[PDB]
Symmetry: C2
Subunit: 93 residues, 2 copies
């Protein structure tokens, strides 16, 4: 209904798209996230330029420490990136 | 561009819509958030049914403790609610 909900549904749809598309529906693996960020985000992952950047990114996300990235971990990634994004736009950093 | 980005932009647009519409552009107050959640979310805030629910909700959000809700606080609210939402759909809770 509301646009905010549309956004929330979008996050659900993309997470489900990848977690659902491969492996466990509610768990995201290195290979899979590597695909989801590239398919959805370009500049964010691309900015690192490093090939091991994906590995570096996922280690931080695995608060859980199970070697996998979880929907909650992913959720904070997009949200924190969202606030950081607006900050980048208005603010230099 | 990508749908995920569209969602991120939507979160930015709604936060900015309210924080920007009233008071400080980067700070959300009780009165204002009361308006943003109702305008964007219905069932989430409505479910509490209590009138003081807004107050109860904001206290948790003010990690900062400044009596205001910040974009980052709001960001985690929608994100955590997003994962909790999908959980509600697939899962009973
Ligand atoms: S987070 C904002 C990033 C910007 N639109 C860009 O990368 O072009
Ligand atoms: S978080 C999912 C909530 C559901 N769509 C509803 O409230 O109807
Ligand atoms: Ca998966
Ligand atoms: Ca994990
Ligand atoms: Ca404001
Ligand atoms: Ca605060």
């Amino acid at each position: 209904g509301s646009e905010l909900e549309t956004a929330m549904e979008t996050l659900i749809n993309v997470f489900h798209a990848h977690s659902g598309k491969e492996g466990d529906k509610y768990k995201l693996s290195k290979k899979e996230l590597k695909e989801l960020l590239q398919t959805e985000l370009s500049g964010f992952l691309d900015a690192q330029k490093d090939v091991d950047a994906v590995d570096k990114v996922m280690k931080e996300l695995d608060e859980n420490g199970d070697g996998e990235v979880d929907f909650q971990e992913y959720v904070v990634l997009v949200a924190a990136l969202t606030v950081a994004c607006n900050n980048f736009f208005w603010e230099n950093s």
